[PDB]
C-alpha cells in the first residue's frame, strides 16, 4: 500500500471543443420515413423496383422538389437534378411492358459529379444520445421471427435497433449484388425492409434509394461511392449541424393525425454522397451477429445470478420484472430497468458499434476496456497498478476527435466514472 495522496484517481476523459458533430451513418436512423404497402395474404417477394413504385403510390402528396437546406460544399442543383432523374427513370420503368429486375441509370453530368466519376475536432451534439434512446425503444412492428432464447427474441423482435439490422443487411446485400453484377453502371437500388404489424400482416417498407457508382472491388479496402436519397419528416432546420454532409429537398406534403386533428407536414428527401468498402459492405451484411453478441452478453449475465442461487434464473428474470439493472440516467440519478430493457440497450449498443464502425471506435474500445478494469479494481479497493494511466489516457483521448459515436461513448464512460468513484 502507498500513502493516499500518491494514489492516482482516474480523471474524466477530455472531450474536444469545436462545432457540433454531424451525422455519418450510411443511412438515416431515427429520421427515416417508410412508405409501406401491406403485402398480399401469401406475402410473396415482389421485385425491388416494383415494390418501390407501389410503395411510392401509397403517398398522395408528391410535389415539385425544392432545395430547403443546401450542402455547404456541394453543387446543390446536381442533387436536385439527381432526384428528378430518379423519378424520370422510375417513370421510364412504368412506361415499359414489365418492371425490370435492375435499373442502370443514365450517366448524366449530375451523377458523374455526385459519384466522383476529417481531422478537425467537433463537440458532442445532443442528437447522438437521442438516436441511441430511439434505438432502445419498441416499435409497433416485428422485425424478426422466433434453447430458451425466445425470451430474448420476444424482448428485441419489435426493438428499433432490430429494424436497423434488417435495413442494413438488406441494403448492403443489394449493394454487394449490384457491385458484382454491374461494376461500371450507376444502378438504382431501393432501400427496403419487411416487418409484421400487431395484426400479423406482412408489410414492405421503402426508405428511399441509393445510386451505386463505379464498383471494381478487387480488394476489401476498395471503395464504391453512392448517393443516398432518403425520405424523412424531420425538418433540417431543427438541428442543422446534424445535416452538414447533406443536401435536403422538400418533396411532398404528408397528412398526419395530431391533437388539433389532421395536419399537413412537409416530407423531405435527405441526399448525400457517401462510400463504403467491400469489407464494410460485408460487415453490414453480418449485422444479425449483433443479436447473437447481445444474446451472449444477456446469457453470461444471467449465468452470474444463476451461479449465485445455484439455480437457473432465466425464467424468473424475463417473467418477473422485479429484478433490475442500472441502464439509464437523468438529473435525478441512475435508473434501473427490467431484463427486457437490458436486452434492448445491449442490442442497440452492438448495432451502433456496427452502424458507426471506425478505427477511432476500435482504439477507444481496446484502450477504454483497460481503464474500465482499473476503475472496477479501484471500486473494489484492490490497489491496481496505475503507472500507465498517462499512456492509457493519451491513447484514448487521441480517439476523441469528431466521431459522434466515440464521443458519446466517452461521455457515457465519464458518467459511469462519476457514479463508480462517488
Amino acid at each position: 500500500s502507498i500513502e493516499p495522496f500518491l494514489r492516482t484517481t482516474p480523471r474524466p476523459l477530455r472531450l474536444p471543443d469545436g462545432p457540433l458533430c454531424h451525422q455519418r451513418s450510411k443511412f438515416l436512423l431515427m429520421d427515416a420515413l417508410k412508405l409501406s404497402i401491406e403485402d398480399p395474404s401469401h406475402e410473396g417477394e415482389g421485385i425491388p423496383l416494383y415494390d418501390a413504385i407501389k410503395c411510392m403510390k401509397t403517398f398522395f402528396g408528391w410535389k415539385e422538389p425544392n432545395i430547403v437546406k443546401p450542402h455547404e460544399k456541394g453543387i446543390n442543383p446536381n442533387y436536385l437534378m439527381a432526384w428528378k432523374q430518379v423519378l424520370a427513370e422510375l417513370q421510364d420503368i412504368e412506361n415499359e411492358e414489365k418492371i425490370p429486375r435492375t435499373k442502370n441509370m443514365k450517366r448524366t453530368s449530375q451523377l458523374k459529379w455526385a459519384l466522383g466519376e476529417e481531422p478537425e475536432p467537433r463537440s458532442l451534439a445532443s442528437w447522438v444520445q437521442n438516436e441511441f434512446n430511439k434505438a432502445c425503444e419498441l416499435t409497433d412492428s416485428s422485425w424478426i421471427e422466433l434453447m430458451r432464447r425466445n425470451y430474448f427474441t420476444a424482448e428485441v423482435s419489435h426493438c428499433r435497433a432490430t429494424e436497423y439490422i434488417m435495413k442494413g443487411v438488406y441494403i448492403n446485400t443489394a449493394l454487394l449484388n449490384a457491385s458484382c453484377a454491374a461494376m461500371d453502371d450507376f444502378q438504382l437500388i431501393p432501400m427496403i425492409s419487411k416487418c409484421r404489424t400487431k395484426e400479423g400482416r406482412r408489410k414492405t417498407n421503402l426508405y428511399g434509394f441509393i445510386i451505386k457508382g463505379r464498383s471494381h472491388l478487387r480488394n476489401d479496402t476498395d471503395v464504391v461511392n453512392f448517393v443516398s436519397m432518403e425520405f424523412s419528416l424531420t425538418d433540417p432546420r431543427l438541428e442543422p449541424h446534424k445535416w452538414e454532409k447533406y443536401c435536403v429537398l422538400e418533396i411532398g406534403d404528408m397528412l398526419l393525425r395530431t391533437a388539433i386533428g389532421q395536419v399537413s407536414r412537409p416530407m423531405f428527401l435527405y441526399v448525400r454522397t457517401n462510400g463504403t468498402s467491400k469489407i464494410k459492405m460485408k460487415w453490414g451484411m453480418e449485422m444479425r451477429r449483433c443479436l447473437l453478441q447481445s444474446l451472449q452478453q444477456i446469457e453470461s449475465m444471467i449465468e452470474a445470478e444463476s451461479s449465485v442461487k445455484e439455480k437457473d434464473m432465466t425464467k424468473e428474470f424475463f417473467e418477473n420484472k422485479s429484478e433490475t439493472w442500472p441502464i439509464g440516467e437523468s438529473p435525478r440519478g441512475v435508473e434501473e430497468g427490467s431484463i427486457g430493457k437490458v436486452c434492448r440497450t445491449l442490442l442497440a449498443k452492438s448495432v451502433f458499434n456496427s452502424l458507426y464502425a471506425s478505427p477511432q471506435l476500435e482504439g477507444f474500445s481496446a484502450e477504454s476496456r483497460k481503464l474500465l478494469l482499473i476503475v472496477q479494481a479501484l471500486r473494489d479497493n484492490l490497489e491496481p497498478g496505475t503507472f500507465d494511466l498517462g499512456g492509457l489516457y493519451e491513447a484514448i483521448e487521441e480517439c476523441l476527435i469528431n466521431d459522434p459515436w466515440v464521443l458519446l461513448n466517452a461521455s457515457w464512460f465519464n458518467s459511469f466514472l462519476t457514479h463508480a468513484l462517488k
Binding site: F132, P326, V375, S415, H419, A420
Partner: peptide, 10 residues
C-alpha cells in the same frame, strides 16, 4: 437517457 456503461455499477 440510456447508457450501457451504467451496467458496470452492479
Amino acid at each position: 437517457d440510456y447508457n450501457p456503461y451504467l451496467l458496470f455499477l452492479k
